[PDB]
Symmetry: C3
Subunit: 130 residues, 3 copies
């Protein structure tokens, strides 16, 4: 019976070493998942920056265009007034609003940072275990 | 008998710690899943804004083309009235702009499938302890 | 008495081992699916960059044509009268992020539990 107890003790100790190895892997997975998610966060911030920049450029361009056409139309009409013509000199002078939208990922970036933090609180305490 | 009770004690201690470690795993699965779902929403919003901006751009160029045509016609009519060899027909056109759109439908489907399978992987803590 | 307790201990150990290998099997599936999810996000980010940079190019090409049309129109008007801003398009470059993301995915896939060693 003494032998049998030595065997069970041998099994238990071998199993623990493997279980510690397994949980070490798990900690590596958590670390790498966290890193990956942090990289995705960065990419998302960079996307918003460029997308919002492009929206601002579009808005500013449209504003300038509207002024250009207004000035041009004013000039053309004044020329027409001088020429005594029945033809219309008041076309091409205006620009409709084009509905430029913007990206705000504030809520999403915040939740993503939050999950990253809580993920990093999931690490197994291996020293306690093994 | 003495050796047995120390062994049973080791086993119970190990089980407590193992169940605790798997609890950490389940939390990690939950937070990974939450993170991916949040990324999914961000991707959807990015697509909406990118496609809106492509529509705004097409809509702008469309109006611009009409404005340049009307302006060019007026200038040509003035040149015709003035009896001039100088060209009144320049600045009247816009070349095609080539606006493209984003379609993440396939990616969104695969991401959802991966999130659902992730959430099938929880450890049954009650079975274990 | 003593043998009876020893059988219960062996039984407890085997049952726990069975449950532990099943649990780590789940862990491996979680690793697989997290990896898949991240590769899918990666593809999405590449497609976003493509469409964003194309739209930036279109905007530049447009602005270029516009400056020329306005110069021509301005010349025409001035000639009739005689007879009588920089748009900063930025571009998205995720190359560093894509490289780090790929590194994390590869290393995550190096964390699989060896179920055979455990079992
Ligand atoms: Cl994970
Ligand atoms: Cl055990």
């Amino acid at each position: 019976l003494q032998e049998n107890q030595k065997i069970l003790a041998a099994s238990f100790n071998k199993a623990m070493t493997n279980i510690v190895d397994a949980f070490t892997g798990v900690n590596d997975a958590i670390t790498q998942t966290s890193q990956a998610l942090q990289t995705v966060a960065t990419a998302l911030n960079k996307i918003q920056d460029v997308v919002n920049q492009q929206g601002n450029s579009l808005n500013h361009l449209t504003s300038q265009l509207r002024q250009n056409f207004q000035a041009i139309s004013s000039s053309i009409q004044a020329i027409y007034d001088r020429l005594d013509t029945i033809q219309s000199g008041g076309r091409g002078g205006s620009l409709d609003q084009i509905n430029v939208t913007f990206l705000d990922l504030e809520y999403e970036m915040k939740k993503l940072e939050e999950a990253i933090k809580k993920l990093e609180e999931s690490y197994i305490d291996l020293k306690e275990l093994g």
